[PDB]
Design a protein around this ligand. Structure first.
Ligand SMILES: [Ca+2]
Ligand SMILES: [Ca+2]
Lengths: 275, 64
């Protein structure tokens, strides 16, 4: 049988599926470690690899990318899980090697590809502790071009008075996503700061794993794809909305969870946002 | 509950591994190049070590 991960229902995606909005014809680029396109519960539309030594983007030697992809768009059938936007056009942009790391330039390159290939939404379940003029420029460029850019806020917890949001989550052009649990409490590892935008389920997230498996991961990595997926659903309902309109709807219709320093605007509500 | 090792920056990889394993015996160590972007999944027993061209710790090792 098929299982609906809690995160999926927590953000109210199912209410949309039932109205017939499943993210059809929305192009979402998962900028990560690749995606196991052979997974029975995934349908990869295409992709490109930016890792010099690893040319097949459809080969996930890390597993992270496959997991994230599953949250975005695991297929609606009678097996595995169900993604937030199961009808979305999934593109695998591999910018990370097997070890889960990538040079800043590989990441930038992926963003460039993303823009040039008309992706609607970009998901970046990755981060670094420092910025770059070039990194900033690529994300700014994506948003100027009409792309919805979402990234993990980071897993640095709290550090006194300081913001612990990583890059590219830190940039204002990006929707930086924090992690809450099934009870809407902030996960202890979830980075905090003025730059945190919204929260999504990031604890015990059941998704797809390479070689026809399923498993649960924790991380702001897991929260991100929920928002990426939601954006896709909104665009499936409102194909004519701008990235700005998408972002706004998501930010203005959240469930307040507490102090913005810790929670940004709160938990996303795709049903409310799609209104 | 030692989750960071400030003392190790500048130390060699081999040296670093010994201190860590001493503090957190169950640690799963991974060596990566400094100045890289990484995945944002949180693993409670993992310790990422970012090294320079010299194989010396370039950033404060911390759990996650
Ligand atoms: Ca399924
Ligand atoms: Ca931000």
């Amino acid at each position: 049988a098929q299982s609906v991960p809690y995160g999926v229902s927590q953000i109210k995606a199912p209410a949309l599926h039932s109205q017939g909005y499943t993210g059809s014809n929305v192009k979402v680029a998962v900028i990560d470690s690749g995606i196991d396109s052979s997974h029975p519960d995934l349908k990869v539309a295409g992709g490109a690899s930016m890792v010099p030594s690893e040319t097949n983007p459809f080969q996930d030697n890390n597993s992270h990318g496959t997991h994230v992809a599953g949250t975005v768009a695991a297929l609606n059938n009678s097996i595995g899980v169900l993604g937030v936007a199961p009808s979305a056009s999934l593109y695998a942009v591999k910018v990370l090697g097997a070890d889960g790391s990538g040079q800043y330039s590989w990441i930038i390159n992926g963003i460039e590809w993303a823009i040039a290939n008309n992706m609607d939404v970009i998901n970046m379940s990755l981060g670094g502790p420092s910025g770059s003029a070039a990194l900033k420029a690529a994300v700014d460029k994506a948003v100027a071009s009409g792309v919805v850019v979402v990234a993990a806020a980071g897993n640095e917890g709290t550090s006194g008075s300081s913001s612990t949001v990583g890059y590219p989550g830190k940039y204002p052009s990006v929707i930086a996503v924090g992690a809450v649990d099934s009870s809407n409490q902030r996960a202890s590892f979830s980075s905090v700061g003025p730059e945190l935008d919204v929260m999504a389920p990031g604890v015990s997230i059941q998704s797809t794993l390479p070689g026809n498996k399923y498993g649960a991961y924790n991380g702001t990595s897991m929260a991100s794809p929920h928002v990426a997926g939601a954006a896709a659903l909104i665009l499936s309902k409102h194909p004519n909305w701008t990235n700005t309109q998408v972002r706004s709807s998501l930010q203005n219709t959240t469930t307040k969870l507490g102090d913005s320093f810790y929670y940004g605007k709160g938990l996303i509500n795709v049903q409310a946002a799609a209104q | 509950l030692k989750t960071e090792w400030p003392e190790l920056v500048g130390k060699s990889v081999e040296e670093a591994k010994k201190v860590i394993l001493q503090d957190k015996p169950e640690a799963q160590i991974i060596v990566l190049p400094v100045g890289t972007i990484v995945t944002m999944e949180y693993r409670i027993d993992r310790v990422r070590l970012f090294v320079d061209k010299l194989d010396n710790i370039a950033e404060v090792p911390r759990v996650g």
